[PDB]
A paper describes a structure:
Using a newly-obtained dataset, which allowed multiple rounds of 3D classifications, we determined a final map at an overall resolution of 3.5 Å calculated from nearly 150,000 particles. Using our 3.5 Å map, we performed fully flexible refinement of the model to obtain the final structure. The experimental refined model, while close to the original design, shows some key backbone and sidechain movements that result in a tighter and more compact designed interface. The rigid-body subunit movement consists principally of a small clockwise rotation (≈2°) about an axis approximately perpendicular to the 3-fold symmetry axis, while the largest differences after superposition are found in the three helices by the designed interface on the 2-fold axis. Another difference is a movement of the sidechain of residue K23 on H2, which repositions such that it forms a hydrogen bond with the sidechain of E52 on H3. This interaction is also present in all six subunits of the parent aldolase crystal structure (Fullerton et al., 2006), but was not accounted for in the design model. Model refinement in Rosetta allows convenient use of Rosetta's InterfaceAnalyzer application, which calculates several metrics important in the creation and optimization of the original design, including binding energies, changes in solvent accessible surface area (ΔSASA), and shape complementarity. Applying the InterfaceAnalyzer to the novel interface across the 2-fold symmetry axis shows that the movement of the interface helices increases the number of interface residues from 52 to 56, with a corresponding change in the calculated ΔΔG from roughly −30 to −37 Rosetta Energy Units (REU). The InterfaceAnalyzer provides a breakdown of the contribution to the overall ΔSASA from hydrophobic residues; this shows that while the total SASA is decreased compared with the design model, the calculated ΔSASA for hydrophobic residues is increased, suggesting that the refined model has improved burial of hydrophobic residues and provides a rationale for the observed differences between the design and refined models.
Here, we present the structure of a protein complex called I3-01, determined by CryoEM. This designed protein is derived from a trimeric 2-keto-3-deoxy-6-phosphogluconate (KDPG) aldolase (Fullerton et al., 2006), modified to introduce complementary hydrophobic interfaces resulting in self-assembly into a hollow cage with dodecameric geometry and icosahedral symmetry (Hsia et al., 2016). I3-01, comprising 60 aldolase subunits arranged with icosahedral symmetry, has resisted high-resolution characterization. The I3-01 complex is large (26 nm diameter) and hollow, resulting in an assembly with a high solvent content, potentially making structural elucidation by X-ray crystallography challenging.
Author numbering:
A (entry chain A), B (entry chain Z), C (entry chain Y), D (entry chain X): 1 to 201
Write the structure that this text describes.
């Protein structure tokens, strides 16, 4: 899995108001070149969307679940075929469950104390969230004491600063509203703009 | 079926060099607002593409087959779930087969003699091909002797003249290379431009 | 209680160097239109001030306790008639005690991990502190994964930015030194300026 | 120990790529007037460097260990004669060990919740890290609810802002790359510039 992040260098963090909106947006994103799509559990019947998008997996997409905040949600996400589980926070109970099921799990951290607590569970890739608050500087600071930890920031990434996150040394960037807000066509165009900007830095 | 043509007012006539290209282009077209997609039998394993795109049917797409030139091809297209069969020409053998299977069939004509030969088989919607040769004038001429026949031209339709075909009085327009040539993103953008231009005329 | 926050939209976080200073400042704040006053346990004999200000409760004030950092302090605050308990941090022991006594309790969080740990205790209103560090952006980021959590930032609120906190979507703002620093008259005037600015946004 | 921090008002947080580099840099720093040197466990055989620099202790240096992230590392640091242990985070297990051995221990915090959790262990001096993220504002905010806690920020300190950290009211500043990056001569010169700038504010 880690290798997939390194290759693609972008995750779409997809939020929608309905099942229908979610599926159409997932397609708009895929076509642009963003092969990693995270279906958030803030989408009604998110579980359904994860299963019904299984036809994209065959085309080279890797579909995961986001905003997973309990072991009960996590189990539904894995059973429904999620390729990876992402949480907003660090959770010991979910981390244990995923390990037994062998599903890659990316917890969230914001502080050195949360960071170390994650590392003791064996995690070396961490979600940095909210990114816009801690900023690119956080990643540069962490490189010092923890050379072997890599971050995927979520929140605040846009076409003016996406290259600064990469110059600091992140693994990949997650993009929310800056990507997926708009019509299905506008979204596809924005997605292209991100991939070109990343491959260019 | 006729009602679907009247509502959507556009068909994509999809040609590709591979199975993979075809599926990605079908998606680029769908998202833009073009709900009628014709998978031509000039695409290698076109039959496969028709079946594997069945997940779009659930989203409101109607997927058919194009350039069907024998009863043997037609049967494979129908068995694979094609929603309609389109030929480049008028063929008595295919017309008979489709009627028994109850699948809408749109033959091709170019001349008044081919036109009348079709009408005697009970067809009232005809494919006009190649459109760029006969031009918009053909449709205006046919309105006279055959008020009850409607055309769907294919070939030569573009963003400079698509409204002239509608002002003459066609049922819908089929678009080939002018739509589907380009990258998956460029295609989606072109598709939007067509739908907006038609709804505007 | 929640309803009271929604109506008033401001809390004074009162710090003083003596019992006498605290009571006079509480009055300066009340008269201006700020009906929610938090008496911090950094005021000597804070407990006394909470009891002796009980005559304001009859006039429509709701007087609570702030900077409550142990179960021992909390019990004294509740026994002395505090209408709500506010802590600088999330504390399981205090949260349990207040629940049994039925006194509204607003814990502090700074990180998504602290946030979720609070939600599991049943808290939906959280103190965001220090606000000036995390900024207005934190609230916008949290709206995504936790649509059902609302914040009351403390620290950094002033007459130049108080409307940005509201546009992000906070429940209410707590104001410290920017309000309560100055003479009893100057404080009353500042309080008026805040209420007018909030009602205006 | 606290008294030593108050007197010197600067710590060098030393990172190096080899044993040899570390020893030469420790000397460059010492001569400039920075008597507190923290040998990070990111230096290969950091333990060796701590022991072999014991000749500086006689000259008035106080040599400690940094980036100590397990009880196993901590024990080696103390046995090797470290004068103080610094961690990147708050750790209950290390805090207990050091207390029994009587070695001053400075944990890391970033949030009010981490802060209070430290205070319950009896710590009144805290490492604030990463400083550049939380900024000088964090210290001003904490002065309110916790008048009796003092910070030593690490990260982001430089010759343009070192006086702002002191005006907020920190105990001392830790300096990383802004000091120790460069040749042994350049480092000595930078060290002088820091001491003069601090004594001047």
């Amino acid at each position: 899995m880690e290798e997939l992040f390194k290759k693609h260098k972008i995750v779409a963090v997809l939020r929608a108001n309905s099942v229908e909106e979610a599926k159409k947006k997932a397609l708009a994103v895929f076509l642009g070149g963003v092969h990693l799509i995270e279906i958030t559990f803030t989408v009604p019947d998110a579980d359904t969307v994860i299963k019904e998008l299984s036809f994209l997996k065959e085309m080279g997409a890797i579909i995961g679940a986001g905003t997973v905040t309990s072991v009960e949600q996590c189990r539904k996400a894995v059973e429904s075929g999620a390729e990876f589980i992402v949480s907003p926070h660090l959770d010991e109970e979910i981390s244990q469950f995923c390990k037994e099921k062998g599903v890659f799990y990316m917890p969230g951290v914001m502080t050195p104390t949360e960071l170390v607590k994650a590392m003791k569970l064996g995690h070396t890739i961490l979600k940095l969230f909210p990114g816009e608050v801690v900023g690119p500087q956080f990643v540069k600071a962490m490189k010092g004491p923890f050379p072997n930890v890599k971050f995927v920031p979520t929140g605040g990434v846009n076409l003016d600063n996406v290259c600064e996150w990469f110059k600091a040394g992140v693994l990949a960037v997650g993009v929310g509203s800056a990507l997926v807000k708009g019509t299905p066509v506008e979204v596809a165009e924005k997605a292209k703009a991100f991939v070109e900007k990343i491959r260019g830095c």
